[PDB]
Amino acid sequence: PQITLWKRPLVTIRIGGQLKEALLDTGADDTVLEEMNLPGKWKPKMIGGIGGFIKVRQYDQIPIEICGHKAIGTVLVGPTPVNIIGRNLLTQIGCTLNF
Amino acid sequence: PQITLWKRPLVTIRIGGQLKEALLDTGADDTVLEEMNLPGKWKPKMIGGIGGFIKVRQYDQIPIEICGHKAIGTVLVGPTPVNIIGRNLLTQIGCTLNF
Numbered sequence: 290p291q292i293t294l295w296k297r298p299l300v301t302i303r304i305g306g307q308l309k310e311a312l313l314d315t316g317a318d319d320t321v322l323e324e325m326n327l328p329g330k331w332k333p334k335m336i337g338g339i340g341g342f343i344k345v346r347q348y349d350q351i352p353i354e355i356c357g358h359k360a361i362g363t364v365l366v367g368p369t370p371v372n373i374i375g376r377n378l379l380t381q382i383g384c385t386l387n388f
Numbered sequence: 389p390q391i392t393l394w395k396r397p398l399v400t401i402r403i404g405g406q407l408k409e410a411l412l413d414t415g416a417d418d419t420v421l422e423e424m425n426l427p428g429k430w431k432p433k434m435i436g437g438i439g440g441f442i443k444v445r446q447y448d449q450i451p452i453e454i455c456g457h458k459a460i461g462t463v464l465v466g467p468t469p470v471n472i473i474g475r476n477l478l479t480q481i482g483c484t485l486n487f
């Protein structure tokens with residue numbers, strides 16, 4: 290599909306077969322999800338945005354479907370107010386910016 | 389153009405007759421530029437991101453040419469690691485997400 294930017298580009302994602310609303314974010318290098326108790330090993334990480342750094346848990350090779358398109362890769366979990374789909378997964382679904 | 393996301397979507401902007409690199413950021417509502425002088429009145433504002441809130445200066449009605457496309461709108465100036473072109477100006481240049 291084509292998504293305009295009049296509003297926040299929010300789409301449904303599926304992770305663990307669970308559905309969430311998430312922001313398609315070309316300005317994020319990484320995918321960052323709201324606190325969730327995901328199974329498996331993880332590694333501590335820090336990521337910086339506007340305002341400073343937050344601590345996140347890095348989970349690798351996690352399947353996640355974005356607007357019906359399958360993806361698998363690294364997902365960071367931490368205290369974000371919004372689920373963020375970053376470039377690592379946006380490339381996997383063939384997402385582009387066009388003007 | 390069509391821009392893929394294997395690298396950060398950085399483009400050259402021209403603002404106040406000066407060239408800068410800025411990030412095309414669909415996850416940002418607002419446009420936020422690194423410390424710089426812009427003419428005209430500004431007002432103090434606060435904006436929030438992943439790491440928390442920052443203080444910015446809000447300049448309204450500011451011409452910016454983004455990768456050859458003209459916008460005139462609100463530009464926030466403050467402590468950011470990267471120049472960010474947000475949805476307020478991405479919409480003006482006809483930018484969409486596509487997959």
Ligand SMILES: Cc1c(O)cccc1C(=O)N[C@@H](CSc1ccccc1)[C@H](O)CN1C[C@H]2CCCC[C@H]2C[C@H]1C(=O)NC(C)(C)C
Nearest residue numbers: 316317318319337338339415416417418436437438469470
């Ligand atoms: C989440 C993330 C990563 O995993 C890796 C790199 C950057 C980011 C990141 O937070 N990037 C942001 C741009 S600000 C930015 C800061 C530093 C470097 C590059 C960009 C997001 O694209 C936009 N970001 C998306 C989103 C992040 C969660 C909080 C709510 C919004 C806040 C919004 C944002 O910050 N908007 C402003 C108007 C304040 C600019």
